[PDB]
């Protein structure tokens, strides 16, 4: 009954800020601004943030603090018919650690590779290089940059793989890096939040030291201002386009990461009367703020490339891992004191990742430890078995075709599943549990009910929000493709099973928990729609 609590209030805020400030704060937001009308993109971004993202961010934090249990225990206590939401969501974050962790290992592999005087991705005259290597980025696909060839042909060895069927040799230098990542995640997550809330002081604050000196370094190169122009010069024609509204909606939802049961988990350890509303507004601003700061860090360097290095802007203004692993390191290698900037850049990448992966793992631990007392007792043993499974199957992403394994999980394992889970999460709290019961819960904690704005957003805007994102995400679906390679038809189907394995437990647990409860039909529904609190 007596639940642990944060050693300090900063432990909670830094570990929430940590979970929310990840890699997509640096490798997508700045791109979407350059792509969708510069500073004008801040309007649909800010609106979807205000009506879509923030209301869902606030809702899960208050749910966790109020119900004081992990993901699967809490959703059963809110609407027993929808107890499957907890299982789907703990499975989604279970799959997420089968691939997302490799990006932290990539950053660490580049970190250990940076312990030199001439960074190895500069020139085109190496073993791994091809005749079609060129110094910097181009727009012709057959002719790659030196940093692109270094990543694909030395770090990844992706060229030695003929697709998903051919993973090939296991690259043991990266199995080592993934192990260092999982070891770091362990001795920070095994003693619970007493140690977790302290490790997150380094990992959640270091990106701000790294952003600060890279912002200074970045803003003092020739052509630095030209980059800020591409970043922000407004073109309000974008606002009218329905894509950029769905681009803003999608980015705001993903960057806050609500509904995975990890914000819920962190908040479950709060004191019942903590001002969760204040906390939600503060940490969420710090998240979107960091993305704005980061865009200057990235595009100051981008304009320096275009000005003094002679590259077309659209050839280097990219998103995803391509930006942080080939484009930005290519610019670093041209500036004075290059190996210093690479070191703190890749450490920024890794410390940006550990934070958010702490949350996804904690969501699993807290949800299981709060439903199965067997697990709650033997935790540090249980998370060793968790991270040992993570490492073993993780070896698939350390093989030569390991990027093909990564790409498949990235577009199936969790993307569509989490949108469905959170869609049912919105309807559970607002339409079955009721905004009445929820707003009254918030009043008991923080002293006042949430205004009707938050109530209309939870009840009406958020379902439409999540559908808007999902519809435009399905309109853009095509069978899986990476570069010239097209995935076999069986690999596409297997991706849908991973997407369905989680979501299927909304109705599976429903019909099971429905059939196994006594009474007539209406009796069964009201039994499984009366919350746990209303029965105690």
């Amino acid at each position: 009954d007596e639940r642990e609590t944060w050693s300090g209030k900063v432990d909670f805020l830094l570990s929430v800020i940590g979970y929310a400030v990840g890699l997509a704060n640096v490798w997508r937001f700045p791109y979407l601004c350059y792509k969708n009308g510069g500073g004008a993109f801040l309007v649909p971004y800010g609106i979807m943030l205000a009506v879509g993202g923030i209301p869902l961010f606030y809702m899960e934090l208050a749910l966790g603090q109020h119900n004081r249990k992990g993901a699967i225990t809490c959703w059963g206590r809110l609407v027993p018919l929808f107890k499957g939401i907890g299982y789907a969501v703990v499975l989604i974050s279970f799959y997420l650690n089968f691939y997302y962790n490799v990006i932290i290992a990539w950053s660490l592999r580049f970190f250990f590779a940076s312990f030199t005087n001439s960074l190895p991705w500069t020139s085109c005259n190496n073993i791994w290089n091809t005749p079609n290597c060129r110094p910097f980025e181009g727009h012709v696909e057959g002719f790659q940059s030196a940093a692109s060839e270094y990543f694909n042909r030395y770090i990844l060895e992706l060229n030695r793989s003929e697709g998903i069927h051919d993973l090939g040799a296991i690259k043991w230098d990266m199995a080592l890096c993934l192990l260092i990542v999982y070891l770091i995640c362990y001795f920070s997550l095994w003693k619970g939040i007493s140690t977790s809330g302290k490790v997150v002081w380094f990992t959640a604050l270091f990106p701000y030291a790294a952003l600060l000196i890279l912002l200074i370094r970045g803003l003092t190169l020739p052509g630095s201002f030209l980059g800020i122009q591409y970043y922000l010069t407004p073109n309000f024609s974008a606002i009218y386009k329905a894509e950029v509204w769905a681009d803003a909606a999608t980015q705001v939802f993903f960057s806050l990461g609500p509904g995975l049961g990890s914000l819920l988990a962190y908040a479950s350890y709060n004191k019942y009367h903590n001002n969760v509303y204040k906390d939600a507004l503060l940490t969420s601003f710090i998240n979107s703020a960091t993305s704005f700061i980061a865009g200057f860090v990235i595009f100051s360097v981008l304009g320096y490339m275009a000005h003094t290095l002679g590259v077309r802007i659209e050839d280097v203004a990219t998103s995803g891992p391509g930006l942080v692993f080939v484009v930005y390191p290519a610019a670093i290698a041209t500036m004075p004191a290059s190996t210093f900037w690479a070191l703190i850049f890749f450490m920024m990448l890794a410390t940006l990742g550990l934070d958010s992966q702490f949350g996804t793992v904690e969501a699993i631990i807290t949800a299981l430890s709060d439903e199965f007392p067997k697990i709650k007792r033997n935790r540090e043993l249980f998370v060793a078995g968790l991270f040992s499974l993570y490492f073993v199957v993780g070896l698939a992403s350390c093989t030569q075709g390991g990027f093909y394994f990564f790409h498949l999980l990235d577009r199936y394992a969790a993307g569509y599943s989490i949108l469905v889970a959170v869609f049912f999460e919105a309807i559970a709290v607002s339409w079955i549990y009721g905004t009445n019961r929820f707003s009254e819960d918030i009043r008991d904690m923080i002293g006042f009910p949430p205004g009707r704005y938050w109530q209309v957003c939870w009840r009406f805007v958020a379902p439409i929000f999540l559908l808007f994102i999902t519809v435009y995400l399905l309109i853009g679906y095509e069978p899986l493709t990476y570069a010239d390679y097209v995935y076999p038809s069986w690999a596409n189907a297997l991706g849908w099973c991973i997407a369905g394995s989680s979501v299927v437990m909304i109705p599976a647990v429903a019909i099971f928990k429905l059939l196994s409860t006594p009474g007539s039909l209406r009796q069964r529904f009201t039994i499984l729609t009366t919350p746990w609190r209303d029965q105690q």
Partner: antibody
Amino acid sequence: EVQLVESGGGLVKPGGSLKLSCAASGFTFSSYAMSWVRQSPEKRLEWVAEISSGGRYIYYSDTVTGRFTISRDNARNILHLEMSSLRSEDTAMYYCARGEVRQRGFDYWGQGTTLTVSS
Amino acid sequence: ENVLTQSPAIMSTSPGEKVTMTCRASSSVGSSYLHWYQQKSGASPKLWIYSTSNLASGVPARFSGSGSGTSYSLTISSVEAEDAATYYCQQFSGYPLTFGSGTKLEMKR
């Protein structure tokens, strides 16, 4: 335009039981916590019990817990205070006050109903 | 239980003068949660000041509130006869909710 009217209330023997009622009007009763504040004949105010908007969160004074029961009829818009095992220290005027936001206090007060416990 | 006691208990000032009265808590109260009530003789209390300083609907501007921690105070800039009443402070941060001892404001003559 908000109106709170306290009903019930009278003279009771010690140990007896009485139910007080507050008829609310002029606002949506269903989204406002309510409390009962009593004022002794020596004029000192003492909070008695708070019931939340949906009736799911209830708090009592120590002087009063175990003997009083607070409740709402959010359909008919009436607040209630079932009393039992009454002693003479319960003699006071009983006020029905609306207080939903703790940071803003008690917006409106009824004009009171008077209880006397005596033999 | 958080015991709020006020001083002076009874207090006479002639109209026009400044009037200051204090409310002390046996245990600290957050500024967001301390309120003030005016009760005229034979009538119900009326919410007067909420969250330490904020005047309620219809409260004239001569009234003001200040304080923090365990020491708060109500102040009438220039008093009037219609201000003769009894003023109660109240904390709303901890159950049991408690009202202050009260201060009767009476007119000098």
